Structure formats: structure tokens, C-alpha cells
């Protein structure tokens, strides 16, 4: 829906250029819940099409700690899908 600006997320948006050059897609979804109104951070990843390819939720630590996990697992597939075709 958009895109946030902060201290933290100046490593974070450089990842992003990778995401284009390998071919993916990848949601996130945050302040949207149903009855409970929880705050969450989900992260997930799919085709155009429709296969999709995984998911994860991260609550824990503050921010920092929060991003680190976060920013870790997207730099974690890249390489893994370097390797097939």
C-alpha cells in the first residue's frame, strides 16, 4: 500500500532492488487485524499467478531486533534461489 521512512529501514530499502532481479514478489501486512486488534508484523511471499511460496509472522523485542529477523529471511531465499534455474 506504501512505503515507510526511517532510520532503520535505510539497510532495509536497499534490499529491495534485489527483489526485481530475481524474479519475485513479496506482501506485508500490518494494521489491519480482525476482533482482536493486535499490533503484528506478517510477511509474505508469492507468484503472479497464484503458487504461492511462504509466509512468516514476527512478534518479539522491539524494532531493532524486530527488523534484523526480518530483513535476515529475504536475504536468506536469494541465494537459494540463485542455485535453480
Same mark, same amino acid.
Given at each position: 500500500?506504501?512505503?515507510?521512512?526511517?532510520?532503520?529501514?535505510? /539497510?532495509?530499502? /536497499? /534490499? $529491495?532492488?534485489?527483489?526485481?532481479?530475481?524474479?519475485?514478489?513479496?506482501?506485508?501486512?500490518?494494521?489491519?487485524? /480482525?476482533? =482482536?486488534?493486535?499490533?503484528?508484523?506478517?510477511?509474505?511471499?508469492? #507468484?503472479?499467478?497464484?503458487?504461492?511460496?511462504? $509466509?512468516? $509472522?514476527?512478534?518479539?523485542?522491539?524494532?531493532?531486533?524486530?527488523?534484523?529477523?526480518? =530483513?535476515?529471511?529475504?536475504?536468506?531465499?536469494? #541465494?537459494?534461489?540463485?542455485?535453480?534455474?
Amino acid at each position: 500500500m506504501g512505503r515507510l521512512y526511517s532510520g532503520n529501514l535505510a /539497510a532495509f530499502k /536497499a /534490499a $529491495t532492488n534485489k527483489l526485481f532481479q530475481l524474479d519475485l514478489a513479496v506482501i506485508y501486512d500490518d494494521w489491519y487485524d /480482525a476482533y =482482536t486488534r493486535k499490533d503484528c508484523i506478517r510477511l509474505r511471499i508469492e #507468484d503472479r499467478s497464484g503458487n504461492l511460496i511462504d $509466509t512468516s $509472522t514476527f512478534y518479539h523485542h522491539d524494532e531493532d531486533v524486530l527488523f534484523n529477523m526480518c =530483513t535476515d529471511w529475504l536475504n536468506h531465499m536469494y #541465494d537459494q534461489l540463485k542455485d535453480w534455474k
